[PDB]
Design a protein around this ligand. Structure first.
Ligand SMILES: C[C@H]1C2=N[C@H]([C@H](CC(=O)O)[C@@]2(C)CCC(=O)O)[C@]2(C)N/C(=C\C3=NC(=C\C4=NC1=C(CCC(=O)O)C4(C)C)/[C@@H](CCC(=O)O)[C@]3(C)CC(=O)O)[C@@H](CCC(=O)O)[C@]2(C)CC(=O)O
Ligand SMILES: C[C@H]1C2=N[C@H]([C@H](CC(=O)O)[C@@]2(C)CCC(=O)O)[C@]2(C)N/C(=C\C3=NC(=C\C4=NC1=C(CCC(=O)O)C4(C)C)/[C@@H](CCC(=O)O)[C@]3(C)CC(=O)O)[C@@H](CCC(=O)O)[C@]2(C)CC(=O)O
Lengths: 208, 208
């Protein structure tokens, strides 16, 4: 039979050590470095770190919000379903409104995507939330427009990591320029649900 | 306010056209090419195609199995939750046994990961199934060992795309060498749930 390593806790340790031995992580603060390592781990890609950008203090602020019980608002089910419940510090609610039955008609009325329209349903949980956008550039652009209104509830942090060829790089560059609340992005086309989930999981628990 | 493209159907078309204009896709058959384009789209990474390998006839065989009602067996919830139900041709069941309450003790008894142990519960649905492994190298290695027993039910196809630094590249290279059933892999460290889901979604429906 095929022989292979079967100890999961050991595989995690070995993966993180391989990443730290290869990656270019010097510019990151200790709180940022742990997040970047987990993102590289999720992507299977040393080199991803050259694209990661944080607002100063974001990693400290997002961990404090999660420890205070902040909900995590997710643009897609792959993100909400990926968050490790066992790593959550304060029984944090993990929400995704994409599949709400009111979303298809609301998107039609708004002239926007279902991913963006679903963010309107985040309003009651948005104040102090940790936002996790790993898919949809239109959700990130729409959130920036929602936050231009002073009446809109404001999240504690935004993990803005949508992936893609159309609008993704622009949505993340616009988030960093707008600086609405503390943020982290993967500049360019890279991103996605796995990288976004890894950022949430890294910030949720102090143990790698 | 920020201006951006809001037509989702249009964004998909533009994304696929950008990928076809940049990517090195000549070696793929027409059935394989559509799968590779969707995988690049999910990853946000032209260049991913240099790592993709298919067994001859896999893309045709996997689409035929899905059209015949084959279940899709997934190593992780990010994979099962990512599959687009609307693209499924024959009310295909999408299964993930990772969270079954019997898995933690079975993994302890087997001396293996929860991801690998959960595959034992796939046995009743495995004959003719489409396997979608996007996370766990130990699930892919364990499946290869299960299939060395002639009594084991055999899937119609394996999408073997686990990501990672430890065991991932080896598990996928071992799947291609063993050639148990038709397969597709992303050679090396790259892979993951998004790429795996994109392969399933591409094979499920004839419309991109
Ligand atoms: C094409 C655009 C859009 N994708 C639709 C969305 C549907 C909608 O919201 O109306 C629309 C049409 C619009 C989203 C938007 O552009 O903001 C949505 C979000 N994608 C989903 C799955 C997939 N998307 C991926 C990447 C991208 N997709 C899009 C991109 C935009 C840029 C581009 O095309 O290059 C990028 C981001 C690349 C892969 C996942 C990536 C990951 O997890 O890492 C995967 C798996 C690829 C695949 O389709 O096979 C469903 C997520 C459902 C959920 O989680 O609840 C979805 C709601 C469609 C559906 O099934 O109904
Ligand atoms: C470290 C190893 C393992 N990961 C555990 C698994 C737990 C277990 O099965 O016992 C164990 C410990 C073992 C799996 C194995 O190696 O086969 C499992 C599968 N990972 C999960 C999430 C994550 N994994 C990722 C990648 C990898 N992880 C591992 C790798 C192995 C190689 C390496 O480390 O480089 C790679 C594959 C890189 C990212 C997702 C990647 C994606 O979707 O694209 C993300 C999000 C990273 C993160 O942890 O933040 C849960 C999936 C749960 C589910 O879907 O139901 C999990 C069951 C743990 C949990 O939360 O209980």
């Amino acid at each position: 039979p095929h022989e292979y390593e079967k100890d999961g806790a050991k595989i995690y340790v070995q993966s993180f050590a391989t990443i730290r031995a290869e990656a270019d992580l010097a510019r990151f603060t200790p709180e940022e470095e742990v997040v970047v390592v987990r993102m590289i781990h999720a992507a299977g890609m040393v080199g991803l770190e050259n694209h990661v950008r944080f607002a100063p203090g974001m990693a400290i602020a997002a961990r404090a919000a999660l420890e205070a019980g902040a909900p995590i608002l997710c643009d897609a089910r792959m993100v909400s379903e990926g968050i490790t419940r066992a790593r959550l510090p304060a029984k944090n609610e993990v929400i995704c409104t994409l599949q709400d039955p009111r979303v298809p008609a609301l998107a039609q009325e708004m002239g926007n995507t279902r991913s963006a329209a679903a963010l309107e349903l985040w309003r009651p949980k948005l104040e102090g939330a940790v936002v996790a956008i790993g898919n949809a550039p239109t959700a990130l652009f729409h959130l920036l427009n929602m936050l231009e209104d002073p009446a809109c509830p404001r999240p504690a942090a935004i993990i803005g990591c949508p992936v893609g060829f159309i609008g993704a790089a622009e949505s993340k560059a616009a988030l960093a320029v707008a600086n609405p609340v503390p943020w982290v992005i993967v500049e360019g086309r890279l991103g996605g649900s796995a990288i976004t989930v890894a950022a949430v999981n890294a910030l949720a628990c102090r143990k790698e």
